[PDB]
Amino acid sequence: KHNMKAFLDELKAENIKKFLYNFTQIPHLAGTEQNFQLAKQIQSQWKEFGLDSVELAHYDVLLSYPNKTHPNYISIINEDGNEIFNTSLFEPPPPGYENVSDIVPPFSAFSPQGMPEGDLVYVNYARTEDFFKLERDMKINCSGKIVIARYGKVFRGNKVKNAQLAGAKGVILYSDPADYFAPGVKSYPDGWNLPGGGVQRGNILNLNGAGDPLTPGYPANEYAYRRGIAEAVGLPSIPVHPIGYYDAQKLLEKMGGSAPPDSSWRGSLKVPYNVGPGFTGNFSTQKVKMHIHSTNEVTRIYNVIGTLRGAVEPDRYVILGGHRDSWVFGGIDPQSGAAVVHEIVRSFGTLKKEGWRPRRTILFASWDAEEFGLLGSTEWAEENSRLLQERGVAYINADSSIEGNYTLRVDCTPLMYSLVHNLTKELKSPDEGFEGKSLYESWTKKSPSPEFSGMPRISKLGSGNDFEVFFQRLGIASGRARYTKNWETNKFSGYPLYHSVYETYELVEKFYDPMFKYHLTVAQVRGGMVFELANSIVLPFDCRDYAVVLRKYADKIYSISMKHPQEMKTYSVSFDSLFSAVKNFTEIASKFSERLQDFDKSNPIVLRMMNDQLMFLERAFIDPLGLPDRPFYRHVIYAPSSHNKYAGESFPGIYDALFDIESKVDPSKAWGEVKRQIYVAAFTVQAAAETLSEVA
Amino acid sequence: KHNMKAFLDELKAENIKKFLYNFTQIPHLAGTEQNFQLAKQIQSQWKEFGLDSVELAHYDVLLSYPNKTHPNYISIINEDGNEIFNTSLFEPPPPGYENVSDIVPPFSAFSPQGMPEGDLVYVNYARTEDFFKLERDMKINCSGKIVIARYGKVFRGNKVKNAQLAGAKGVILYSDPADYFAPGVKSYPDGWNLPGGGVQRGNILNLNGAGDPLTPGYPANEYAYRRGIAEAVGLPSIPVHPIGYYDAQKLLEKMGGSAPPDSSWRGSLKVPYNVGPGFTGNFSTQKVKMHIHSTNEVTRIYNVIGTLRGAVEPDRYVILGGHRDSWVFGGIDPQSGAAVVHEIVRSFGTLKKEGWRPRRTILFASWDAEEFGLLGSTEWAEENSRLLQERGVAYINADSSIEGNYTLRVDCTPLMYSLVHNLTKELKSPDEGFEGKSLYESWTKKSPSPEFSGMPRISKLGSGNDFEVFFQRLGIASGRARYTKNWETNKFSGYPLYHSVYETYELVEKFYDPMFKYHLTVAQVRGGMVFELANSIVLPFDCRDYAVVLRKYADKIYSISMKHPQEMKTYSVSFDSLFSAVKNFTEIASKFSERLQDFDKSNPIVLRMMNDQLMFLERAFIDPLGLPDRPFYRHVIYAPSSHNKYAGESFPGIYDALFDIESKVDPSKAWGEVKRQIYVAAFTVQAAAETLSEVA
Numbered sequence A, B: 001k002h003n004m005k006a007f008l009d010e011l012k013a014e015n016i017k018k019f020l021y022n023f024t025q026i027p028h029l030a031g032t033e034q035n036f037q038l039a040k041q042i043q044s045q046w047k048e049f050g051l052d053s054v055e056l057a058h059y060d061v062l063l064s065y066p067n068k069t070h071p072n073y074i075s076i077i078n079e080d081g082n083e084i085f086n087t088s089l090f091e092p093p094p095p096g097y098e099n100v101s102d103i104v105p106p107f108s109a110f111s112p113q114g115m116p117e118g119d120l121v122y123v124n125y126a127r128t129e130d131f132f133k134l135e136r137d138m139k140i141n142c143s144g145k146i147v148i149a150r151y152g153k154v155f156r157g158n159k160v161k162n163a164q165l166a167g168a169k170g171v172i173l174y175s176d177p178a179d180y181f182a183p184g185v186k187s188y189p190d191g192w193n194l195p196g197g198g199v200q201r202g203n204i205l206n207l208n209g210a211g212d213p214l215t216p217g218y219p220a221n222e223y224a225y226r227r228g229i230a231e232a233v234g235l236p237s238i239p240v241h242p243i244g245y246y247d248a249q250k251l252l253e254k255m256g257g258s259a260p261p262d263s264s265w266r267g268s269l270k271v272p273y274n275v276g277p278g279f280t281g282n283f284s285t286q287k288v289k290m291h292i293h294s295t296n297e298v299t300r301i302y303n304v305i306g307t308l309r310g311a312v313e314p315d316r317y318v319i320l321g322g323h324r325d326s327w328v329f330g331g332i333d334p335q336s337g338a339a340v341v342h343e344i345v346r347s348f349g350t351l352k353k354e355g356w357r358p359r360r361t362i363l364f365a366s367w368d369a370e371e372f373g374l375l376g377s378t379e380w381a382e383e384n385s386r387l388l389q390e391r392g393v394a395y396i397n398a399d400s401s402i403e404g405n406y407t408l409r410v411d412c413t414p415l416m417y418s419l420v421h422n423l424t425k426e427l428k429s430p431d432e433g434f435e436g437k438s439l440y441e442s443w444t445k446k447s448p449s450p451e452f453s454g455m456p457r458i459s460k461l462g463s464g465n466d467f468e469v470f471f472q473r474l475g476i477a478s479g480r481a482r483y484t485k486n487w488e489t490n491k492f493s494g495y496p497l498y499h500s501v502y503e504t505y506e507l508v509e510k511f512y513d514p515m516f517k518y519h520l521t522v523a524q525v526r527g528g529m530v531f532e533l534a535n536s537i538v539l540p541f542d543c544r545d546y547a548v549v550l551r552k553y554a555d556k557i558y559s560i561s562m563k564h565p566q567e568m569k570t571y572s573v574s575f576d577s578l579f580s581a582v583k584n585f586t587e588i589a590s591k592f593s594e595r596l597q598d599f600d601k602s603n604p605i606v607l608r609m610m611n612d613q614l615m616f617l618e619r620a621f622i623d624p625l626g627l628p629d630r631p632f633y634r635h636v637i638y639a640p641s642s643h644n645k646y647a648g649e650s651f652p653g654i655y656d657a658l659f660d661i662e663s664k665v666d667p668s669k670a671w672g673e674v675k676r677q678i679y680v681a682a683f684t685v686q687a688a689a690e691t692l693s694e695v696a
């Protein structure tokens, strides 16, 4: 029998382990030779695994690298101009890698060059509300100051944007042990915590879905016409650099000026967490100096694209994609995901060698330059946009398979909720205490839905990964799954060794998943989703689940507006049209579901009409005009939060029109824009509903 | 037998005649009660003809009307402020209609209000090159002058835009007998020429595809949020009014200042055609005063939408659409087309009552407010955009069936060239001297292709009709056909009685088509196209015809650039990428054609893959970012000319980047934009080609 069970049983923990080891012995930084060689290896292996074609798709995109002979660092300087304290030039390498070459030192990718000198202001997490607190309540002016911010809570790019708009002349990012040192656990190599010399790499762009900064809208191919740097998308205007907490303690310990406004501003170091500006009396003439000499340069990147042609609907694509480029060894991010994809390809290929093909075509992708802004996935999607929007059934992401070892994490479109519930009921739980029980059962017990008893938590898709182009630009139903930590104790800043040199094969094998059972469970979830999407006769999407969430989101956004009852009266702000559209969607979706159950099962045209209606439903939520000042965020229901790229926001156009509205100087204009966004949302919901009506 | 022959034989000249009479006894101005009543009549009749459903789709859009108690007119005023000459308040009504109520007086729809006074400058046709001649060569400054321009050569909206940008404070449009009085033919009612009291109505918007000025992007439904007038799309800033040639002679006869630069500036009136500014010595203190009091107001409009559900592919739409609203009686425009649609619906309905259905769904549309900016078609398409872009096979327009009686006129996508050649070879010629010969033969003889011996002329689609949203915004294969005058003697300003009160049933019956044979031929062409598109197993599109034209257009645009060889050297401007893409398109299209011929004809999925590849080919030429500053013109190959909405331009983005480039102050920037447009075009052509490659 060639069925899902055969596919799933072929997957092996031991193969995932072997592949992870293979992928994490040297760094695979985007645009370097080592990552091209890995691309070529994966191409070769996918061909031997049995795929029909496997090609490299390359692009020439803007990347960023430190200058090897002019290192980045930060100083405290006295009034004479002597540098009395310098931050580290590199992370101490882990045991047995102290001779590995080409470890990129910590830096903030895409920082401009500069050597700004000034007084330090401490800005907590550099969130929108942190800056509101400084400027509006505490009356502290960041203009011309160097800000120091702790990592965590939001994407680092949003921190940098927020500091720029506050008038900062540079940003220092650091990892506080409050956020990256779990109590009771040892620092690497003796446990999974961040040492004081550890530093988190990461880009600080604000691309809003654009892809390569120089070529928004179009692939960065050989004849592409590039923007000049001054017109590039998303580059920061001020220098930025990340440090560890040993170094941060030295910059923070002398801070003076105002006390922290409350305890939510204090991390775990032995310093006051004074906001500044500047240092206490005895050190008041000392300053902080940054030295940033990184360079942006157009560099070639390589995606691997594998095809397993469908037997019946070869013009329908189900995509499994995840990235290959890493900051250093990529022990978790991304190779724990890449090894899972590799084993999925192997298992599908085993069935293929026995004569099986999926119903629909499956595309497998090893993306490049994800770490530098989702560049590889976005350029490929830009190149192939027409194929994807008319043929794209679904995209399943495959970055890190683990961020913890407690339970499952799923973020996806509502169209996949039913598919995920049904699949996880057929999979075995890997969890201690749930031997012989389903993954659905363990997941639901450990991560209960906040709404519905007996159901598990499934989150909105946010961003900060390679699904963004597919979901928020093109409107292709998308999802992701991985193992995670306890939601109850989750402080939402990720695992301690994120984007550090310490993220190694040994981290995973010793401390996260020694038996590779959580990896195997994630391979079964990702692979099983792909299998069902590519082989089910009727696409496994339930439109009724979108109806339920649309009502929840309408209730939410209405509740936000209702904090302003006087203005809603004055400006005649009604949500009636949106609730009407959501009611109609609910009714039409119910009727479509009945037909889908009842239609003549012998009629392949009626089936395809209904499969096309299902495929184009996510597509219907796209507005070709995009969201305000974010033309590549086109989905009307979901966009990455304007304050935090990692978080999904629902009804984003109305949300942003309402945000901080009490502060706008022209309320008539501001509430007019709220009404405009309500109209756009109600229209889009009704238009999406109508795609599920009888076609003629 | 229920085949195309049965459909075609059922069409009757005498029915078209009866319907034309029925539709032209009273005015049907958009937004008036009479046009709502006609909508309701056509709805009722299409239901009785046998359509499956027939509904009204209404919208509330910005329209424009004169003030009934404060008429528009133009004066010559002396230095005392006495009005010594006034233009007419209405056209003399034709025989037997002198008691018809509700004839809208001549006006320019969407003119603002005002009473500007000043000196007259005569600007020929108010084309871009006419203003270049005045400003650059003759050194005449239009700033603060009232300009007087003859109708013809270009859409009147482009004249108004050009006059505004020259600094005019008002525009007077008139019909010169050079352009609207055919030598040897009598004035109406004794022949088909424009009398001296006749005046051409028409809107003067510059909408660039937006639809209703207040709701760009979204349908003007009950909850729509409207722009304020100041932010509306496309409204003119200066007052405008049209007059006839009796009145124009009185304004032109006193003109002084500079002589006309050459004879291409002189029309046929007995005046010098002096450019001005102002009048000759004795009258130099006299001035011209406009009085415009029209009002813009949001008004309800009504489309009739009829459905004939497909038997096999009900989710594939073939649309036959034309408008119903008229300026006055609409004897030619639009009712000569509407009567043809009515008879087509009747004939399809006859087959349907006998048990036949087309393979694909046919939609029939009676659009409203076409005369005010393609408003009805565009709002409906905005509402139904998701359905149209995933299901829209083709759109066939059906405005005026005649603009002459000499031969056929076809403007369409290359995807329909083969369909049109094959259909016209099966139709009988109605022409004198071609009795017993095919329409293909008569058409080819009278209107030879300028490229290919033995083939007929087929033009690019321009704009100024209801196909614009479908073709240039949504990328649905579109076409139009009508009878026309001799191309050899055609001065390209249309028929003399265009948009005048004299365009009546009697005009058509006495002077254009007394036997309704040209109407019948046009019904056979439009109807036959719809039949084939809705019933052919394989869609009747030949991708190879696009390959041929893309090469022609690439050669053309290259030739334009090559007028600037030094700049192409300095800025390294290469067309190689575009020629490469066109070469690839040609190769891939040839291979697709082979497969289309060879694929297993028993396999409906392979057929639909290839029908979807054919349907989505026009769609592939759409750029979701649109053309520069024209977001609703998204087709990369074809847009309405920036200088003349009626004319199609090929590779419009590159064309506009090259236009007048020698005058730009920063050549580096200007040639950079040329290169950018070349990249966009080459990319789009290659991406469209790739949609025809094997799918996996």
Ligand SMILES: *[C@@H]1O[C@H](CO)[C@@H](O[C@@H]2O[C@H](CO)[C@@H](O[C@@H]3O[C@H](CO[C@H]4O[C@H](CO)[C@@H](O)[C@H](O)[C@@H]4O)[C@@H](O)[C@H](O[C@H]4O[C@H](CO)[C@@H](O)[C@H](O)[C@@H]4O)[C@@H]3O)[C@H](O)[C@H]2NC(C)=O)[C@H](O)[C@H]1NC(C)=O
Pocket: A577, A578, A580, A581, A584, A682, A683, A686, B055, B056, B057, B058, B222, B223
């Ligand atoms: C959720 O789905 C429902 C349908 O199940 C939609 O209901 C429509 O709601 C609109 C209001 O937004 C109704 O609009 C009204 O239409 C009247 C004419 O309707 C008849 O004729 C049309 C042809 O034009 C037919 O299509 C229709 O079936 C009816 O036979 C107008 O006369 C109304 O305007 C008058 O009242 C309004 C309000 O006071 C005034 O502003 C006007 O000046 C005017 O006097 C109005 O336009 C429409 O009929 C409803 N369709 C139905 C029941 O089929 C909801 O719109 C939908 N929700 C969303 C968000 O789309």
Ligand SMILES: *[C@@H]1O[C@H](CO)[C@@H](O[C@@H]2O[C@H](CO)[C@@H](O[C@@H]3O[C@H](CO[C@H]4O[C@H](CO)[C@@H](O)[C@H](O)[C@@H]4O)[C@@H](O)[C@H](O[C@H]4O[C@H](CO)[C@@H](O)[C@H](O)[C@@H]4O)[C@@H]3O)[C@H](O)[C@H]2NC(C)=O)[C@H](O)[C@H]1NC(C)=O
Pocket: A055, A056, A057, A058, A222, A223, B577, B578, B580, B581, B584, B682, B683, B686
């Ligand atoms: C019309 O259709 C043809 C194909 O029939 C397209 O041809 C491609 O043209 C591009 C040039 O625009 C070629 O690009 C070159 O690719 C080389 C690598 O190609 C190999 O490996 C890739 C995987 O990455 C495979 O997909 C491919 O099949 C080959 O095996 C690069 O090494 C080249 O870059 C080098 O040279 C250039 C030029 O001097 C330098 O600028 C670089 O710095 C570098 O040294 C280059 O990128 C591509 O291989 C061709 N594909 C083929 C033949 O299949 C045309 O592009 C297409 N026209 C348009 C407009 O799309």
Ligand SMILES: *[C@@H]1O[C@H](CO)[C@@H](O[C@@H]2O[C@H](CO)[C@@H](O[C@@H]3O[C@H](CO)[C@@H](O)[C@H](O)[C@@H]3O)[C@H](O)[C@H]2NC(C)=O)[C@H](O)[C@H]1NC(C)=O
Pocket: A021, A022, A023, A025, A040, A041, A044, A045
């Ligand atoms: C990760 O796994 C891959 C795949 O197994 C390893 O690459 C493979 O390495 C072997 C040994 O170097 C290569 O075989 C050799 O080929 C040459 C001749 O071409 C010959 O001199 C040797 O005797 C041997 O046959 C093999 O080609 C290569 N395969 C691919 C697809 O790249 C890789 O070494 C592993 N990496 C790590 C860090 O473990």
Ligand SMILES: *[C@@H]1O[C@H](CO)[C@@H](O[C@@H]2O[C@H](CO)[C@@H](O[C@@H]3O[C@H](CO)[C@@H](O)[C@H](O)[C@@H]3O)[C@H](O)[C@H]2NC(C)=O)[C@H](O)[C@H]1NC(C)=O
Pocket: A081, A082, A083, A084, A085, A086
């Ligand atoms: C932090 O790092 C900086 C930069 O490396 C250190 O400052 C640098 O110190 C060196 C060595 O003392 C200086 O070079 C010397 O300059 C003198 C005077 O011109 C000259 O006599 C020597 O031959 C040599 O060239 C260098 O100028 C100085 N650079 C800067 C930018 O200040 C600093 O010592 C480090 N601080 C700590 C605490 O480690």
Ligand SMILES: *[C@@H]1O[C@H](CO)[C@@H](O[C@@H]2O[C@H](CO)[C@@H](O[C@@H]3O[C@H](CO)[C@@H](O)[C@H](O)[C@@H]3O)[C@H](O)[C@H]2NC(C)=O)[C@H](O)[C@H]1NC(C)=O
Pocket: A418, A419, A422, A539, A540, A541, A542, A597, A598
């Ligand atoms: C997830 O699993 C559930 C439970 O199996 C699936 O729902 C079930 O889907 C089947 C169709 O295979 C429904 O069966 C139908 O029953 C009706 C009679 O009520 C009959 O008209 C049809 O001929 C057919 O036998 C079944 O009712 C339904 N059960 C529910 C909703 O509780 C669900 O479709 C799966 N989701 C996927 C595949 O995305």
Ligand SMILES: *[C@@H]1O[C@H](CO)[C@@H](O[C@@H]2O[C@H](CO)[C@@H](O[C@@H]3O[C@H](CO)[C@@H](O)[C@H](O)[C@@H]3O)[C@H](O)[C@H]2NC(C)=O)[C@H](O)[C@H]1NC(C)=O
Pocket: B021, B022, B023, B025, B040, B041, B044, B045
């Ligand atoms: C254009 O053609 C249409 C359709 O033939 C004409 O409308 C039709 O006019 C007749 C006569 O007025 C209507 O029938 C009448 O109905 C009422 C009762 O409802 C009754 O009092 C009369 O004895 C007679 O039966 C008919 O309903 C109407 N049909 C439609 C669909 O509107 C129209 O008059 C023609 N217009 C011109 C200018 O010739």
Ligand SMILES: *[C@@H]1O[C@H](CO)[C@@H](O[C@@H]2O[C@H](CO)[C@@H](O[C@@H]3O[C@H](CO)[C@@H](O)[C@H](O)[C@@H]3O)[C@H](O)[C@H]2NC(C)=O)[C@H](O)[C@H]1NC(C)=O
Pocket: B081, B082, B083, B084, B085, B086
């Ligand atoms: C062109 O049309 C205009 C506007 O209708 C004509 O000018 C108007 O002439 C009337 C009748 O003479 C004027 O009304 C009268 O005004 C006088 C003085 O205040 C008063 O004694 C009368 O009882 C009556 O109200 C009117 O003011 C004047 N309007 C304007 C705007 O100038 C003009 O005569 C026409 N020219 C030709 C050649 O037909």
Ligand SMILES: *[C@@H]1O[C@H](CO)[C@@H](O[C@@H]2O[C@H](CO)[C@@H](O[C@@H]3O[C@H](CO)[C@@H](O)[C@H](O)[C@@H]3O)[C@H](O)[C@H]2NC(C)=O)[C@H](O)[C@H]1NC(C)=O
Pocket: B418, B419, B422, B539, B540, B541, B542, B597, B598
């Ligand atoms: C317009 O009419 C022409 C002439 O009939 C159509 O072209 C012809 O299309 C038929 C397919 O029905 C081609 O027949 C094929 O012949 C080849 C052998 O060369 C064979 O492999 C196939 O099984 C099939 O019999 C025929 O060659 C072709 N003639 C040409 C191009 O000269 C054309 O398709 C029509 N255009 C439409 C419908 O848009």
Ligand SMILES: *[C@@H]1O[C@H](CO)[C@@H](O[C@@H]2O[C@H](CO)[C@@H](O)[C@H](O)[C@H]2NC(C)=O)[C@H](O)[C@H]1NC(C)=O
Pocket: A067, A068, A069, A070, A295
């Ligand atoms: C990286 O930093 C080095 C070292 O400071 C730069 O190389 C120097 O460049 C200057 C002029 O640009 C030369 O005069 C020096 O002799 C070079 N020094 C050495 C040691 O080679 C280099 O420009 C920087 N790389 C960049 C910007 O990519």
Ligand SMILES: *[C@@H]1O[C@H](CO)[C@@H](O[C@@H]2O[C@H](CO)[C@@H](O)[C@H](O)[C@H]2NC(C)=O)[C@H](O)[C@H]1NC(C)=O
Pocket: A141, A142, A143
């Ligand atoms: C924060 O500090 C800056 C600079 O010290 C203030 O900006 C100055 O004030 C006005 C603009 O509002 C101009 O006259 C100056 O040119 C600005 N200076 C500079 C250096 O840009 C800013 O207004 C302060 N914000 C406060 C007090 O809220």
Ligand SMILES: *[C@@H]1O[C@H](CO)[C@@H](O[C@@H]2O[C@H](CO)[C@@H](O)[C@H](O)[C@H]2NC(C)=O)[C@H](O)[C@H]1NC(C)=O
Pocket: B067, B068, B069, B070, B295
């Ligand atoms: C159309 O023109 C008429 C007549 O000049 C306007 O009606 C007058 O409006 C003013 C104030 O707006 C009144 O004081 C007059 O008594 C009205 N006159 C008459 C004869 O009714 C009317 O405003 C205009 N219509 C528009 C702008 O739609």
Ligand SMILES: *[C@@H]1O[C@H](CO)[C@@H](O[C@@H]2O[C@H](CO)[C@@H](O)[C@H](O)[C@H]2NC(C)=O)[C@H](O)[C@H]1NC(C)=O
Pocket: B141, B142, B143
């Ligand atoms: C055409 O005429 C106008 C006005 O008579 C000129 O515009 C004036 O010149 C400059 C702007 O370039 C300003 O100082 C004045 O305020 C303008 N006047 C007005 C009324 O706008 C215009 O430059 C002339 N163009 C020529 C001679 O080419």
Ligand SMILES: *[C@@H]1O[C@H](CO)[C@@H](O)[C@H](O)[C@H]1NC(C)=O
Pocket: A192, A404, A405, A511, A512
């Ligand atoms: C892995 O699971 C064990 C419990 O089996 C737990 O003690 C350990 O801390 C977990 N590792 C991580 C990194 O959370």
Ligand SMILES: *[C@@H]1O[C@H](CO)[C@@H](O)[C@H](O)[C@H]1NC(C)=O
Pocket: B192, B404, B405, B511, B512
């Ligand atoms: C109609 O055709 C006749 C020739 O049969 C011609 O004399 C007449 O002018 C034509 N009418 C128009 C309006 O062109």
Ligand SMILES: [Ca+2]
Pocket: A210, A211, A212, A214, A215, A216, A217, A218, A219, A220, A378, A379, A382
């Ligand atoms: Ca790009």
Ligand SMILES: [Ca+2]
Pocket: B210, B211, B212, B214, B215, B216, B217, B218, B219, B220, B378, B379, B382
């Ligand atoms: Ca609109």
